[PDB]
């Protein structure tokens, strides 16, 4: 009853909303006279729509798909109709920071509980590029060229919407039913590696780096890009994500990421070095142009003399013989997910983990236009 002039400051935007919505109704009178046509009863029926009401439990959960710190993602069928949706669980406090393009996962609308935000997405049946690299370490060469490119165009779109991902990873990239690639988006999920760490029987480097894949994750987030301008300071720009590409590119071809450090802090370290710390292994197979790319991806993000200045010119690399860059989205995919159903989770590590140091423990549509 101190802040109850909040019912004042709100109820204006309540009247405000209420007004435009109705001047919107007058989007009618569209009036094609370019028709000498009917007559013939009427072509106008307006349902209209609704802001209705909603909730959880209006979705049956099928299986869990993946997990993250803020929360899990999920495969859900809407109880109401039946459908399949990618469902994201997020968190309100405590967690901080208080469209239209073929390339990125589709967030349609959102809704929330007491402590968790809920996101509803088109569901990608094909796992991610994390669980792929695992499945068969991509025997690549040409496999990789495809899954790049498709990555570039993904990325080059995002930048052109004035956005920098600053999260580009094996697990942050998803495979669709044609086995093509869409990246979704950071969600926006957050957190940072800073400032710096202080402490002060193998038989194969491959086998040694195979001390990777550690406790699922459910803690994370590791440097599978982390260009080294992020740590340190305020910075970046579009060139942020190209480093993540070379980071990534290097891994499908080599068998680990460049800086793979066996502790989460020996990256930064190595990565803060590269130069010295970048090394391609003695398991031989890489092209002269394929290596050339990585190094020019993985160099300093440097402007001044240079440009990059990029985002095409990457396409101008010899590493890409063809293709058109046009016909790309219809092309037979390196792996086309073979599925048992519209519910096949076959491509995800259903696992078990279940740890959320969060719970004690124990809707709206005010939108504008209409799909689809």
């Amino acid at each position: 009853y101190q802040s109850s002039v909040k019912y004042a400051i709100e109820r204006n935007e309540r009247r405000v909303e209420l007004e435009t919505e109705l001047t919107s109704h007058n989007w009618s009178e569209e009036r094609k006279s370019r028709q000498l046509s009917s007559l013939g009863k009427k072509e106008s029926q307006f349902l209209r729509l609704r802001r209705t009401r909603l909730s959880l439990e209006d979705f049956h959960t099928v299986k869990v798909i993946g997990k993250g710190a803020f929360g899990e993602v999920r495969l859900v069928q809407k109880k109401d109709t039946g459908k399949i949706y990618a469902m994201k669980t997020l968190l309100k406090s405590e967690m901080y920071k208080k469209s239209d393009s073929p390339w990125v996962v589709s967030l349609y609308y959102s809704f929330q509980d007491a402590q968790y935000l809920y996101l509803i997405m088109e569901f990608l049946p094909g796992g991610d590029l994390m669980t792929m690299l695992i499945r068969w370490q991509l025997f690549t060469e040409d496999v990789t060229r495809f899954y790049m490119a498709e990555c570039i165009l993904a990325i080059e779109t995002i930048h052109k919407l004035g956005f920098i991902h600053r999260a580009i990873k094996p697990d942050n990239i998803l495979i669709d039913i044609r086995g093509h690639i869409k990246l979704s988006d950071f969600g926006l999920s957050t957190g940072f590696h800073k400032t710096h760490d202080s402490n002060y029987n193998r038989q194969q480097i491959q086998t040694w780096r195979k001390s990777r894949r550690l406790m699922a994750y459910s803690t994370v987030g590791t440097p599978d890009y982390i260009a080294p301008e992020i740590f340190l300071y305020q910075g970046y720009g579009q060139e942020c994500d190209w480093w993540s590409l070379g980071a990534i590119m290097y891994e499908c071809l080599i068998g680990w990421p460049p800086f793979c450090s066996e502790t989460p802090q020996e990256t930064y370290r190595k990565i803060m070095n590269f130069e010295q710390t970048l090394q391609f292994p003695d398991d031989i197979h890489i092209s002269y142009e394929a290596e050339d790319l990585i190094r020019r991806l993985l160099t300093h993000a440097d402007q001044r003399l240079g440009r990059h200045g990029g985002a095409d010119e990457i396409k101008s690399h010899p590493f890409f013989r063809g293709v058109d860059w046009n016909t790309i989205r219809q092309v037979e995919a390196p792996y086309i997910p073979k599925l048992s159903s519209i519910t096949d989770t076959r491509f995800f590590p259903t696992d078990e983990l279940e740890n959320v140091p969060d719970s004690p423990a124990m809707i709206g549509y005010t939108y504008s236009r209409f799909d689809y």
Binding site: Y1, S4, V5, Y7, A8, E10, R11, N12, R14, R15, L18, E19, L22, H25, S28, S44, Q45, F46, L47, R48, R50, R51, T52, R53, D80
Partner: protein, 156 residues
């Protein structure tokens, strides 16, 4: 004026069921202002043994919550799909409109006192001017139960 009038080519039922849904929510944020702290009259809920006397305001809690129960119902208020509504709501919505008129009125008679010290008055003025204009427009409320509002109404 133009706002509450049924828009061109909209089913009235939606247009009504939305409009009544807006209104409940607004009165309640307004009583949300007046939360706690608390001629003649008419009292109701009969027969049941009910409808007696002595609300002395501060009842309002179990009064509004029946709308809460009536307007959240799946079958009375078909949010779902294009499944239609019984339209007997036209009777029911008249109740929820008139039962809503009670707290409107009760807030006017006794508790309008505290409102003006907040300089939020014009808000409730308009919103109240909002409620009548709509339901009177659609004749959702008869002229005989507007008797307490009759001296306040005609100011125009």
């Amino acid at each position: 004026k133009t706002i509450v009038q049924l828009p061109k080519y909209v089913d009235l039922g939606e247009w009504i069921a939305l409009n009544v849904f807006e209104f409940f929510t607004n009165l309640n944020q307004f009583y949300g202002v007046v939360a706690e702290y608390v001629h003649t009259d008419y009292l109701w809920l009969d027969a049941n043994n009910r409808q007696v006397s002595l609300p002395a305001s501060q009842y309002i809690d179990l009064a509004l919550t029946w709308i809460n129960n009536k307007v959240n119902d799946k079958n009375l208020f078909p949010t779902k799909n294009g499944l239609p509504f019984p339209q007997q709501f036209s009777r029911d919505v008249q109740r929820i409109m008139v039962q809503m008129f009670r707290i409107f009125a009760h807030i006017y008679h006794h508790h309008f006192d505290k409102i003006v010290h907040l300089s939020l008055e014009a808000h409730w003025n308009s919103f109240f001017s909002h409620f009548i204009s709509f339901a009177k427009e659609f004749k959702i409320i008869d002229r005989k139960e507007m008797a307490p509002l009759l001296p306040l109404i005609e100011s125009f």
